Design an enzyme around this catalytic site. Structure first.
Site, PDB file in Angstrom:
ATOM      1  CD  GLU A 121     -17.591  15.788 -26.395  1.00 51.52           C
ATOM      2  OE1 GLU A 121     -16.592  16.541 -26.428  1.00 51.52           O
ATOM      3  OE2 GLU A 121     -17.636  14.744 -25.704  1.00 51.52           O
ATOM      4  CB  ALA A 172     -22.560   7.832 -63.481  1.00 54.24           C
ATOM      5  CD  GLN A 214      -8.895   3.608 -56.906  1.00 55.28           C
ATOM      6  OE1 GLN A 214      -9.041   2.936 -57.926  1.00 55.28           O
ATOM      7  NE2 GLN A 214      -8.443   4.865 -56.940  1.00 55.28           N
ATOM      8  N   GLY A 262     -19.514  11.050 -62.090  1.00 55.52           N
ATOM      9  CA  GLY A 262     -20.958  10.939 -62.226  1.00 55.52           C
ATOM     10  C   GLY A 262     -21.587  10.135 -61.096  1.00 55.52           C
ATOM     11  CB  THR A 263     -20.614   6.898 -59.495  1.00 56.70           C
ATOM     12  OG1 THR A 263     -20.804   6.230 -60.743  1.00 56.70           O
ATOM     13  CG2 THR A 263     -21.121   5.994 -58.379  1.00 56.70           C
ATOM     14  CD  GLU A 287     -12.213  17.144 -62.112  1.00 57.35           C
ATOM     15  OE1 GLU A 287     -11.695  18.281 -62.015  1.00 57.35           O
ATOM     16  OE2 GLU A 287     -11.583  16.096 -61.841  1.00 57.35           O
TER      17      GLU A 287
HETATM   18  N1  LIG Z   1      -9.548  19.984 -12.502  1.00 59.82           N
HETATM   19  C1  LIG Z   1     -10.022  19.093 -13.403  1.00 59.82           C
HETATM   20  N2  LIG Z   1     -10.630  19.553 -14.527  1.00 59.82           N
HETATM   21  C2  LIG Z   1     -11.113  18.697 -15.464  1.00 59.82           C
HETATM   22  C3  LIG Z   1     -10.975  17.253 -15.242  1.00 59.82           C
HETATM   23  N3  LIG Z   1     -11.522  16.653 -16.302  1.00 59.82           N
HETATM   24  C4  LIG Z   1     -11.997  17.625 -17.125  1.00 59.82           C
HETATM   25  N4  LIG Z   1     -11.752  18.848 -16.622  1.00 59.82           N
HETATM   26  C5  LIG Z   1     -12.099  20.175 -17.193  1.00 59.82           C
HETATM   27  O1  LIG Z   1     -13.527  20.380 -17.300  1.00 59.82           O
HETATM   28  C6  LIG Z   1     -13.974  20.768 -18.605  1.00 59.82           C
HETATM   29  C7  LIG Z   1     -14.480  19.569 -19.394  1.00 59.82           C
HETATM   30  O2  LIG Z   1     -15.590  19.143 -18.602  1.00 59.82           O
HETATM   31  P1  LIG Z   1     -16.260  17.691 -18.700  1.00 59.82           P
HETATM   32  O3  LIG Z   1     -15.396  16.460 -19.277  1.00 59.82           O
HETATM   33  O4  LIG Z   1     -16.477  17.384 -17.271  1.00 59.82           O
HETATM   34  C8  LIG Z   1     -17.877  17.897 -19.477  1.00 59.82           C
HETATM   35  P2  LIG Z   1     -19.051  16.629 -18.962  1.00 59.82           P
HETATM   36  O5  LIG Z   1     -18.383  15.189 -19.231  1.00 59.82           O
HETATM   37  O6  LIG Z   1     -19.528  16.968 -17.608  1.00 59.82           O
HETATM   38  O7  LIG Z   1     -20.300  16.775 -19.958  1.00 59.82           O
HETATM   39  P3  LIG Z   1     -20.198  16.421 -21.524  1.00 59.82           P
HETATM   40  O8  LIG Z   1     -20.344  17.776 -22.158  1.00 59.82           O
HETATM   41  O9  LIG Z   1     -21.356  15.482 -21.750  1.00 59.82           O
HETATM   42  O10 LIG Z   1     -18.846  15.775 -21.743  1.00 59.82           O
HETATM   43  C9  LIG Z   1     -12.633  21.349 -19.032  1.00 59.82           C
HETATM   44  O11 LIG Z   1     -12.368  22.679 -18.545  1.00 59.82           O
HETATM   45  C10 LIG Z   1     -11.657  20.253 -18.653  1.00 59.82           C
HETATM   46  O12 LIG Z   1     -10.424  20.879 -18.995  1.00 59.82           O
HETATM   47  C11 LIG Z   1     -10.304  16.829 -13.995  1.00 59.82           C
HETATM   48  O13 LIG Z   1     -10.131  15.626 -13.740  1.00 59.82           O
HETATM   49  N5  LIG Z   1      -9.861  17.777 -13.160  1.00 59.82           N
HETATM   50  N1  LIG Z   2      -7.535  11.291 -53.843  1.00 59.57           N
HETATM   51  C1  LIG Z   2      -7.986  10.419 -54.773  1.00 59.57           C
HETATM   52  N2  LIG Z   2      -8.723  10.890 -55.806  1.00 59.57           N
HETATM   53  C2  LIG Z   2      -9.208  10.057 -56.757  1.00 59.57           C
HETATM   54  C3  LIG Z   2      -8.933   8.623 -56.661  1.00 59.57           C
HETATM   55  N3  LIG Z   2      -9.521   8.049 -57.717  1.00 59.57           N
HETATM   56  C4  LIG Z   2     -10.127   9.035 -58.432  1.00 59.57           C
HETATM   57  N4  LIG Z   2      -9.907  10.234 -57.868  1.00 59.57           N
HETATM   58  C5  LIG Z   2     -10.435  11.547 -58.288  1.00 59.57           C
HETATM   59  O1  LIG Z   2     -11.846  11.419 -58.443  1.00 59.57           O
HETATM   60  C6  LIG Z   2     -12.285  12.158 -59.581  1.00 59.57           C
HETATM   61  C7  LIG Z   2     -12.831  11.200 -60.628  1.00 59.57           C
HETATM   62  O2  LIG Z   2     -13.962  10.545 -60.070  1.00 59.57           O
HETATM   63  P1  LIG Z   2     -14.099   8.953 -59.916  1.00 59.57           P
HETATM   64  O3  LIG Z   2     -14.282   8.611 -58.457  1.00 59.57           O
HETATM   65  O4  LIG Z   2     -13.043   8.184 -60.670  1.00 59.57           O
HETATM   66  O5  LIG Z   2     -15.444   8.716 -60.745  1.00 59.57           O
HETATM   67  P2  LIG Z   2     -16.726   7.871 -60.289  1.00 59.57           P
HETATM   68  O6  LIG Z   2     -17.238   8.323 -58.946  1.00 59.57           O
HETATM   69  O7  LIG Z   2     -16.370   6.404 -60.333  1.00 59.57           O
HETATM   70  O8  LIG Z   2     -17.788   8.303 -61.409  1.00 59.57           O
HETATM   71  P3  LIG Z   2     -17.915   7.598 -62.848  1.00 59.57           P
HETATM   72  O9  LIG Z   2     -16.734   6.696 -63.099  1.00 59.57           O
HETATM   73  O10 LIG Z   2     -18.033   8.791 -63.765  1.00 59.57           O
HETATM   74  O11 LIG Z   2     -19.170   6.777 -62.741  1.00 59.57           O
HETATM   75  C8  LIG Z   2     -11.062  12.884 -60.100  1.00 59.57           C
HETATM   76  O12 LIG Z   2     -10.992  14.185 -59.506  1.00 59.57           O
HETATM   77  C9  LIG Z   2      -9.935  11.997 -59.638  1.00 59.57           C
HETATM   78  O13 LIG Z   2      -8.701  12.704 -59.516  1.00 59.57           O
HETATM   79  C10 LIG Z   2      -8.136   8.187 -55.499  1.00 59.57           C
HETATM   80  O14 LIG Z   2      -7.854   6.987 -55.340  1.00 59.57           O
HETATM   81  N5  LIG Z   2      -7.719   9.113 -54.623  1.00 59.57           N
HETATM   82 MG   LIG Z   3     -16.056   5.161 -61.835  1.00 58.61          MG
END
Ligand SMILES: Nc1nc2c(ncn2[C@@H]2O[C@H](COP(=O)(O)CP(=O)(O)OP(=O)(O)O)[C@@H](O)[C@H]2O)c(=O)[nH]1
Ligand SMILES: Nc1nc2c(ncn2[C@@H]2O[C@H](COP(=O)(O)OP(=O)(O)OP(=O)(O)O)[C@@H](O)[C@H]2O)c(=O)[nH]1
Ligand SMILES: [Mg+2]
Ligand SMILES: Nc1nc2c(ncn2[C@@H]2O[C@H](COP(=O)(O)CP(=O)(O)OP(=O)(O)O)[C@@H](O)[C@H]2O)c(=O)[nH]1
Ligand SMILES: Nc1nc2c(ncn2[C@@H]2O[C@H](COP(=O)(O)OP(=O)(O)OP(=O)(O)O)[C@@H](O)[C@H]2O)c(=O)[nH]1
Ligand SMILES: [Mg+2]
Ligand SMILES: [Mg+2]
Ligand SMILES: [Mg+2]
Lengths: 430, 427, 427, 430
Positions: free
Chosen positions: A245, A90, A15, A135-136, A174
C-alpha cells in the site's frame, strides 16, 4: 502471518538492529531471554513453549560487533546460527565487500535467510539495514541485494541507509563506496530511506537538549521510525497501511523510490510538559526543515507524495484538518501532477519508550515519509566529492587490487548523473 | 417473498455493513445471538426479507462479507453483533489490494471472486423470490472498488432481471486520505454506469458536515458517520419490511426516479437530525421533516442542489401521518422551488409512507434525489484524474497488474460522457 | 432373515471395520460386552442381520477378521469393542505380505485362506437366509488387496447367487504412502470387475478434503476418516435393519443403480456434515440435505462429477420426512442439472426412506452415485502403473512370488477396457 | 516373535555394536546386568527370571576389542560364548580375513549363530556390522556372508558398512579391501547401508557444535539410525514398515540395493531450544546434502526411492504435506520410472537419548533411506584410487602370499565397473 524479515549488515546495520530489537521486545513484552509472561508474530517466530525468536539475520565480515551481541544482554534472544561473522572485514573497500571477502560468506547467509523465510507463511518482505560508506555495508549489501532479488524476485525490499554527511564524514573513501552502492541500490531496492548522522546530531542537541549525543542516541531514534513503519502490521487501528500500500502511494515512478523520513514530536521530559503537542502541531512540525533526518532544504524542493503515519490517541477528523492547513501553506509546495499527495495511516498504540531513552513519553506521534526533489542536493554534493578524488585517481589502485575495474566507477557516476537528471525532470511544472 | 441479498466489500463496506445490520436487527427485534425478542408481530411478518431462519428460533443475515484482508473480518466477528453472521459467508483473502483497483478487479480479486459467487448462488437458492442485491463499499480503494465492481458484473450476468443497488462512498478532495483515489473512482464509476440499477452516492465530507454543523458533534467518528448511512439504507427498504398506507419497494422507487437508464445516481438524505441540546426546541411534525429533507445541508453528497435541477425526488416517510398533509407539503416544495425542478417531468416528487417509525422517533423521513448537480462530484474526480494521468503518475503499478493505458482513456471518456448527459437534461 | 456376513482384510480393512462395528452396536443398543441395553423394540427386531445371538442375552458380530500380520488383530482385540468379536473369527498369519499383491493373492494368502473359508462357511450355515457379503479393505497394499481379492473369488465360487459388496479404499497420488500401489491396485481392480456386484470407491484424499474443508477439522486422524466411511456403510443397510416408508435393501439398490454388469463402482456421499461452530447457523431440512449430497465436495471419491455424467444415483434418507418433499427435491436436482445425467435413463434418481434416524441427528442422508467420472480415478492409476511397468521397475519381487509379466499386461488391458466402457456410456 | 540377529565383525563392527546395545538396553529398560525391573523380544532372548540376553554375536580375529567388552560395563549382558575371539588379526589383509586366518574361526561362529537362530521362532533376518577397509571387516565378513547365504538362503541380510572416505583415510591398503569386499557384498547382501566417517565428523562439528568428535560420537549416531530402522518391529504406531516391506519399497532392481541413510534432527541442547523443529522442516532437512552420512552430491544424482521413517509425536497428514512440498522442489529430482517414490513409516515412540550423548531430546525424529544414483560417485573415487595402486602392483605380493590370486583383483574391479555402469543406466530418462 504478515512476517517481515530483518537483515542487519556491517557495524552500523548491527548497531541499529540492536536498538530495533530492544524496542520490539519492549513493544511486544518479550524479555531478553525470548520469554513472554498474536501480532508479535510479524517479528518473531515462536518455538515450543515460552520462547520467541527474532525473524532476523545479523551479518558482518569481522567478528567484533556481533561478538558483543553474543556475549551481551540479548544473547539468549537470537539463536547462534542467525549471527553470522567472518574473520577479516572489508576495510572500507567496496570491492572487498562485494567480491574478495563477501564471496566467501554470501552463500551461507543466503541459505540461512531461505531457512528463515521457509518458516514464514505470509512474507511481506525484507528490511535491510546498512551504511553506504563502509566496505561491508556497501559492497556486501549490494551483493546480497542482487542475490535476494534473483532468488525471491517480486518480494518487496526496503533498505534503511546511513548516508554520509556533507561535513561530518568519518572516513576518507566514503564517497567512492556511496557512489558504488547507489548504482546497485537503484535496480534491486523497492524503497530506500536515506538518513544522515549530522541531522540526527542536530536534532538531539536542539530538540532533546543533549550536549553530547552518541551513536546509541541516533540508533534509538532510528528504530522508532522503523517501528512507526511496521506498527500498521504489528497492531491495528482506524486507518491501516500495508507495505505494498505504502509503496503504491509513495512511489510515483520506479526509480523515484527515495522518501525522506521525519519523526514528531522529539522532546525531553521537562520540555514536553509545557508544550501542548496537538495533532495539528506535530503535523506542522513534520514539514519543517530543522526536524529532517537528512541535511537538505525542502523549501528549495517540491513534494511529490507524503505518507503520514500517526500513532496513539488520534482521530481522522483532526488529521484531515492538519492536512488542510498544510495545503494552505505556500512554503510547502507540491508538484502539479499530484492534486492530493497525502497517504494517511492512523494506529491506536501510542509510541512505547525505551527505559533510559532520550525521548519523552507522548500520547501521539507521527512519522512522515515524503518523496521530495530536495534529496537530490545530497547526491549532488556527494557526486562533487567523488569527482574531485577521481580527478586524481586517489585511492583507486586499492579497489583495482581487489578485482574492481576503473570502468565500473565511471559507470556508477553516470548512473547517478542520470538519476539526478530524472529527479530534476519530475520537479518541473508544465 | 421479496428477499434482499446483502454484500459488503472492503473495509468501509464491511464497517458500514456492520452498522446497517446492527440497526436492522434492533428494528426487527433480533438480539446479538440471532433470537427474536421483539414485542410486535409486525417485526417478524417480513423478517425473511433480510434474514434466513435457522434451527431453534434463530435468524441469520442474508449477508456476504468480502475482503482481500482478514483483519476486517476479524474486526467484524469480534464486534457487537459479529456472532449473528453465518461463518461460511465470510469470504476473505490474505494479501490485501494495496489501494490498487487493478489488483481488486483483475488479479487478487479475480482469484478470490469465485468463492464469493458460490456463496451468493447458494444464498439466492435459499430465498424463495430474491428481488435483488445491495452492495456497500467505496470507489477510492482497491477491494471495495475493483473487486466490488467485478463482483457486480458477475452478479448481473447471472441475475440480469434482478434489481442491483449500491451504497458507494465516493472520494472527496477535502477529505482526501489516499493518492490514487481519482484512478480507482474513475475506473469503478464507469463499470457502475453500465451494471447498477440504482447507486446511492455517499460522501464522507458531507457526512462530516452533517455531524459537525447539524448534529453539533464535536468529535465525530467513522462509526457516527456510518450510522447516518445505515439509517438511509434502512429507510429505502422500510416498505418491504413493514405495512403502510402507500407502499413503494426498490423497483417502484427506481421506475419513478430513473427516467433514462444511465441517470441512476442518487443524493440521499435523512430527516430528522438534531443536537441533544436543540431537541426540546422543535416540532415533531411533517412540515418540519419536509423542510429538513429538501435542504442542501442535509444531503449526503457534497453537491449543491441549487447548482442543478432535480429530475426526480422520492420521499419515504415513516410514522403515523396525514396523507393530505404530506401531499400538501410536497406540492408546496415544488411550487415554491419551481426553478430547481426540471419542467418536463410534472409532479417531480414520489411519496411512500410506512406506518412503523424507527426506534426512538415517532416520525422520520428518507429522501432520494436525482439531481443534475451530482455532475459536480464527477467533474472534480475527472479533473483530479486528468492531473495525474497527463503525467502518467503511478500508472506503472496498475500496468504491473496487467492493465493498459487504453482502459484509463476509456473510463475517463465514459465518465465525461455521463457528465455531459446529465448536463443535457439539466439544460 | 436377510443376514449379512462381514469380512475385514488387512490393516485398513480391519480398522475401518472396527469403526463400523462400533457405530452399528451403538445404533442397535449393544454395549462393549455384547449385551442389549437399548430403549426401543425396533433396535432388536432386525438385530439378526448383523449379530448372532449367543447364550445369556448376548450378541456377537457376524464378522471375520483377516490379516497376514497378528499386530492388527491385537490392536483390534485391545480396542474399545474388541471383546465383542468371536475369538475363533480372528484368522491371522504371522509373516505379513510386505505390500506385495502376489504374496497376498498366491503365496502367504493362499496358505492362509482355507481357514478363512472354513470360518465363513460356518458363519453362512449359522444364518437362516444369508443375503450376502461385505468386505472392507484397500487395493494398494498386499493383504487387503491380494488376499482380499482371492477371498472374494473363493466366496463367489461357493455363493454365486448372493450379493457381493466391497468398500475399497483406493490409492490416490496426492496421498501416496507407498511405491508399488499402482501395481497392487491394478491387479485387484481387474479381479473386482468380474467378481463383485457393487464396489464403494473410498478415497483417502477425498476424506481428508471433507475433514479439512467441510468439517473444519484442523488435525484429522485416520479414525476420523474411518468414521465417515462407517457412516456411509451404515447408511446403505439401514433399510435392512429398521422399518420405513419406502424400503430398499442391497439387491434393490444394485438393480436400480447398475444398468450394465461391469458398471458397479460407486462414489459414495454422506449428509449432513457440519463444523461445531457452524452447526447453529443451519436448517435441519430435506432441501438442505439434498443440496449437500449432490455437491462434488461431499463425494468420498476424488473425481469431479461435473467431468462426467451420472448413470444413476440412489439416495437413502433416514428420519421422519415428507415423501412429497423428497420427490420434489430429487426431481428439481435432475431438471436443474440435466446436463450431468445421462439422457437415456429417465428418472436417474432412486429414493429410499427409513424412519429411524442415526443417533445425534433428526435427519440424515446417504448418497450412492454411479458416475462416468470415476474413470478419472482409474486413469491416474493406469498412468502410474505404466510409468513403472514400462521400465519393469520392482517387477522382480512379484515374479519371485510366482507371478509372470503377462498377468500385468492382462490386468492393465482389463482396466483400460473398463475405462473405455465407462467413456462409451458417458458419450 | 519377529526377532533380528545382530552380527558385529572386527573392531568397527564391535564398537558400533557396543553403542547399539547400550541404546537398545535404554530403549527397553534393560539394565547392564540383563535385568529389567513384550517387544524387547525382537532383540533379546529371555532366560528363567530377571535376565535378558542380546540376540547377537560379536566376532574379531584379535582379542583386544572384545576383551574390553568382557572386562567392561556390559560383561553380564552377553554370555561368554557369544563373544568370539581368535589370537591374531587379519592385519588389513582381505586374504587373511577370508582365507588364512578366517577359515580357523568361521565354522565356530556359524555354529553359535545356528544355536542362536534355533532359539528364535520368527526370524526376520540379520543385521551385519563391519568395516569395508579392515582385513577382518572385509575378508571375514565376506566369507561369513557366503556361508550364511548358503545355510539360510532366503533370509534377509542387511549390512551396515563403514565405507572409506575420499580424503580422511586411515590405512593405505583400504581401496584393495573395499573393492574385494564389494564384489561379494553384491551377490550375498539384500540391502547395504554405506556410511562415511568424514561426513559424520562434519555433521558433528557443524550440527552438534562439537570441536573434536571421536569414534564414540560417530557410533552413537549410527546406532540411532539402526534403532529407527528396527523401531517398526520393536514398537507400534499409525503406519508400520517390516523389513521385507522396506526391501520391496526401497529396492527397484536386485543389484541396486544401496540406500543412503540420513537422520534428522541432529542438534545440541542449547541450539534446539530456539529451533521450531516441525515435521515439514525435518523432512526438508533430510533431502539436503550437508546432513548426509556419505560424502557425495545428491544434486548431481537422481532419486529412485525414498523411505521416510518418522518417530514420536507425528501424524500422517503433515507427513503428506511435507512429501508434497518435497515433490515441488526442482533441486530434488526423481527418475521418470517412479511416479511416487515415497514409502512412509510412522511410529509413536520418540527417540530415546543416551545419557551423556551429543544429541538433544526431541519430540519427533526421522530416518530417510533413499536410493540415489549419487552414491556411484563414491565408487568412482574408490575405483580410481584402486587403479593407481594396482598400476604399480603396490602391496599385491602380500595378498598373494596369503593365497589370493591376482586374477581375483581384476575380477573384482570388473564387477564394480559393471555395477557403476548399471547405476548410470537406471538414471537416464527415456
Ligand atoms: N464513511 C466511512 N468511510 C470510511 C470508513 N472506513 C474507511 N472509509 C473511507 O474510505 C476510503 C478508504 O477505503 P477502504 O479502507 O475501504 C479501501 P478497501 O479496504 O476497500 O481496499 P484496500 O485498498 O485493499 O484497502 C477513505 O476515503 C476512508 O477515509 C467508514 O467506516 N465509514
Ligand atoms: N547512525 C549510525 N551510524 C553509524 C553507526 N556505526 C557506524 N556508523 C556510520 O557508518 C559508516 C561507517 O561504516 P561501518 O558500518 O562502520 O562499516 P562496515 O559496514 O562495518 O564496513 P567495514 O568495517 O569497512 O567492513 C560511517 O558513516 C559511520 O558514521 C551507528 O551505530 N549509527
Ligand atoms: Mg565494520
Ligand atoms: N482411510 C483409511 N486409510 C488407511 C487406514 N489405514 C491405512 N490406510 C491407507 O491404506 C494404505 C495402506 O494399506 P494397508 O495398511 O491396509 C496394507 P495391508 O496391511 O492390507 O497389507 P500389507 O501389504 O500386508 O501391509 C494407505 O493408503 C494408507 O494410507 C485407515 O484406518 N483409514
Ligand atoms: N565409524 C567408525 N569407524 C571405525 C571405528 N573403528 C574403526 N573404524 C574404521 O574402520 C576401518 C579400519 O578397520 P577396522 O574395523 O579397525 O579393522 P578390522 O576389521 O578389525 O580388521 P583388522 O584389524 O585388519 O583385522 C577404518 O576406516 C576406520 O576408520 C569406529 O568405532 N567407528
Ligand atoms: Mg482494506
Ligand atoms: Mg499390514
Ligand atoms: Mg582389528
Amino acid at each position: 502471518m504478515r512476517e517481515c524479515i530483518s537483515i542487519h549488515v556491517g557495524q552500523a546495520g548491527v548497531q541499529i538492529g540492536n536498538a530495533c530489537w530492544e524496542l520490539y521486545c519492549l513493544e511486544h513484552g518479550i524479555q531478553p531471554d525470548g520469554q513472554m509472561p498474536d501480532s508479535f508474530n510479524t517479528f518473531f517466530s515462536e518455538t515450543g513453549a515460552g520462547k520467541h525468536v527474532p525473524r532476523a539475520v545479523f551479518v558482518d565480515l569481522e567478528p567484533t560487533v556481533i561478538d558483543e551481541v553474543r556475549t551481551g544482554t540479548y544473547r539468549q534472544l537470537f539463536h547462534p546460527e542467525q549471527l553470522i561473522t567472518g574473520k577479516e572485514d572489508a576495510a572500507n573497500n567496496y570491492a572487498r565487500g562485494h567480491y574478495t571477502i563477501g564471496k566467501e560468506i554470501i552463500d551461507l547467509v543466503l541459505d540461512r535467510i531461505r531457512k528463515l523465510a521457509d518458516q514464514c507463511t505470509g512474507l511481506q518482505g525484507f528490511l535491510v539495514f546498512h551504511s553506504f560508506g563502509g566496505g561491508t555495508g556497501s559492497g556486501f549489501t549490494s551483493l546480497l541485494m542482487e542475490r535476494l532479488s534473483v532468488d525471491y524476485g517480486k518480494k518487496s525490499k526496503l533498505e534503511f541507509s546511513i548516508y554520509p554527511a556533507p561535513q561530518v564524514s568519518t572516513a576518507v573513501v566514503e564517497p567512492y563506496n556511496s557512489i558504488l552502492t547507489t548504482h546497485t541500490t537503484l535496480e534491486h531496492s523497492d524503497c530506500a530511506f536515506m538518513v544522515d548522522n549530522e541531522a540526527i546530531y542536530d536534532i538531539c542537541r536542539r530538540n532533546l537538549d543533549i550536549e553530547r549525543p552518541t551513536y546509541t542516541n541516533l540508533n534509538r531514534l532510528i528504530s522508532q521510525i522503523v517501528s512507526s513503519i511496521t506498527a500498521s502490521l504489528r497492531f491495528d487501528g482506524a486507518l491501516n497501511v500495508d507495505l505494498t500500500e505504502f509503496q503504491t502511494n509513495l512511489v510515483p515512478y520506479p526509480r523515484i523510490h527515495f522518501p525522506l523520513a521525519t519523526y514528531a514530536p522529539v522532546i525531553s521530559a521537562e520540555k514536553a510538559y509545557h508544550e501542548q503537542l496537538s495533532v495539528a502541531e506535530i503535523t506542522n512540525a513534520c514539514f519543517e526543515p530543522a526536524n529532517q533526518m537528512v541535511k537538505c532544504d525542502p523549501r528549495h524542493g517540491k513534494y511529490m507524495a507524503c505518507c503520514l503515519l500517526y500513532r496513539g490517541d488520534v482521530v481522522p477528523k483532526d488529521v484531515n484538518a492538519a492536512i488542510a492547513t498544510i495545503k494552505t501553506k505556500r512554503s510547502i509546495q507540491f508538484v502539479d501532477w499530484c492534486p492530493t499527495g497525502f497517504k494517511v495511516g492512523i494506529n491506536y498504540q501510542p509510541p512505547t519508550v525505551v527505559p533510559g531513552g532520550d525521548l519523552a513519553k507522548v500520547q501521539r506521534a507521527v512519522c512522515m515519509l515524503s518523496n521530495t526533489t530536495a534529496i537530490a542536493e545530497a547526491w549532488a554534493r556527494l557526486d562533487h566529492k567523488f569527482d574531485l578524488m577521481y580527478a586524481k585517481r586517489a585511492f583507486v589502485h586499492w579497489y583495482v587490487g581487489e578485482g574492481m575495474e576503473e570502468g565500473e566507477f565511471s559507470e556508477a557516476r553516470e548512473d547517478m548523473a542520470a538519476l539526478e537528471k530524472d529527479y530534476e525532470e519530475v520537479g518541473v511544472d508544465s | 417473498m421479496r428477499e434482499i441479498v446483502h454484500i459488503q466489500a472492503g473495509q468501509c463496506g464491511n464497517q458500514i455493513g456492520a452498522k446497517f445490520w446492527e440497526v436492522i436487527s434492533d428494528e426487527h427485534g433480533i438480539d446479538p445471538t440471532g433470537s427474536y425478542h421483539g414485542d410486535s408481530d409486525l417485526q417478524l411478518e417480513r423478517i425473511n426479507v433480510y434474514y434466513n431462519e435457522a434451527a431453534g428460533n434463530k435468524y441469520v443475515p442474508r449477508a456476504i462479507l468480502v475482503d482481500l484482508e482478514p483483519g476486517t473480518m476479524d474486526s467484524v466477528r469480534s464486534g457487537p453483533f459479529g456472532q449473528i453472521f453465518r461463518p461460511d459467508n465470510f469470504v476473505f483473502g490474505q494479501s490485501g489490494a494495496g489501494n490498487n483497483w487493478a489488483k481488486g478487479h483483475y488479479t487478487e480479486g479475480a482469484e478470490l471472486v469465485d468463492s464469493v459467487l458460490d456463496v451468493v448462488r447458494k444464498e439466492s437458492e435459499s430465498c424463495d423470490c430474491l428481488q435483488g442485491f445491495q452492495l456497500t463499499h467505496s470507489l477510492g480503494g482497491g477491494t471495495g472498488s475493483g473487486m466490488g465492481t467485478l463482483l457486480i458484473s458477475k452478479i448481473r450476468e447471472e441475475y440480469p432481471d434482478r434489481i442491483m443497488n449500491t451504497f458507494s462512498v465516493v472520494p472527496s478532495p477535502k477529505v482526501s486520505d489516499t493518492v490514487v483515489e481519482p484512478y480507482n473512482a474513475t475506473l469503478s464509476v464507469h463499470q457502475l454506469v453500465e451494471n447498477t440499477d440504482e447507486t446511492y452516492c455517499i460522501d464522507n465530507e458531507a457526512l462530516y458536515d452533517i455531524c459537525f454543523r447539524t448534529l453539533k458533534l464535536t468529535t465525530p467518528t467513522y462509526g457516527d458517520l456510518n450510522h447516518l448511512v445505515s439509517a438511509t439504507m434502512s429507510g429505502v427498504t422500510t416498505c418491504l419490511r413493514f405495512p403502510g398506507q402507500l407502499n413503494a419497494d426498490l423497483r417502484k422507487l427506481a421506475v419513478n426516479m430513473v427516467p433514462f437508464p444511465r441517470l441512476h445516481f442518487f443524493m440521499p438524505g435523512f430527516a430528522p437530525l438534531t443536537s441533544r441540546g436543540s431537541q426540546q426546541y422543535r416540532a415533531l411534525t411533517v412540515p418540519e421533516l419536509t423542510q429538513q429533507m429538501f435542504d442542501a445541508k442535509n444531503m449526503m453528497a457534497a453537491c449543491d442542489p441549487r447548482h442543478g435541477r432535480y429530475l426526480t425526488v422520492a420521499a419515504v416517510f415513516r410514522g403515523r401521518m396525514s396523507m393530505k398533509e404530506v401531499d400538501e407539503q410536497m406540492l408546496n416544495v415544488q411550487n415554491k422551488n419551481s426553478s430547481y425542478f426540471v419542467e418536463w417531468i410534472p409532479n417531480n416528487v414520489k411519496t411512500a409512507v410506512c406506518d412503523i417509525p424507527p426506534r426512538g422517533l415517532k416520525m422520520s423521513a428518507t429522501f432520494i434525489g436525482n439531481s443534475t448537480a451530482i455532475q459536480e462530484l464527477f467533474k472534480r474526480i475527472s479533473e483530479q484524474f486528468t492531473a495525474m494521468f497527463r503525467r502518467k503518475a503511478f500508472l506503472h503499478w496498475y500496468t504491473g497488474e496487467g492493465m493498459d493505458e487504453m482502459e484509463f482513456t476509456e473510463a475517463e471518456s465514459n465518465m465525461n460522457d455521463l457528465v455531459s448527459e446529465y448536463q443535457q437534461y439539466q439544460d
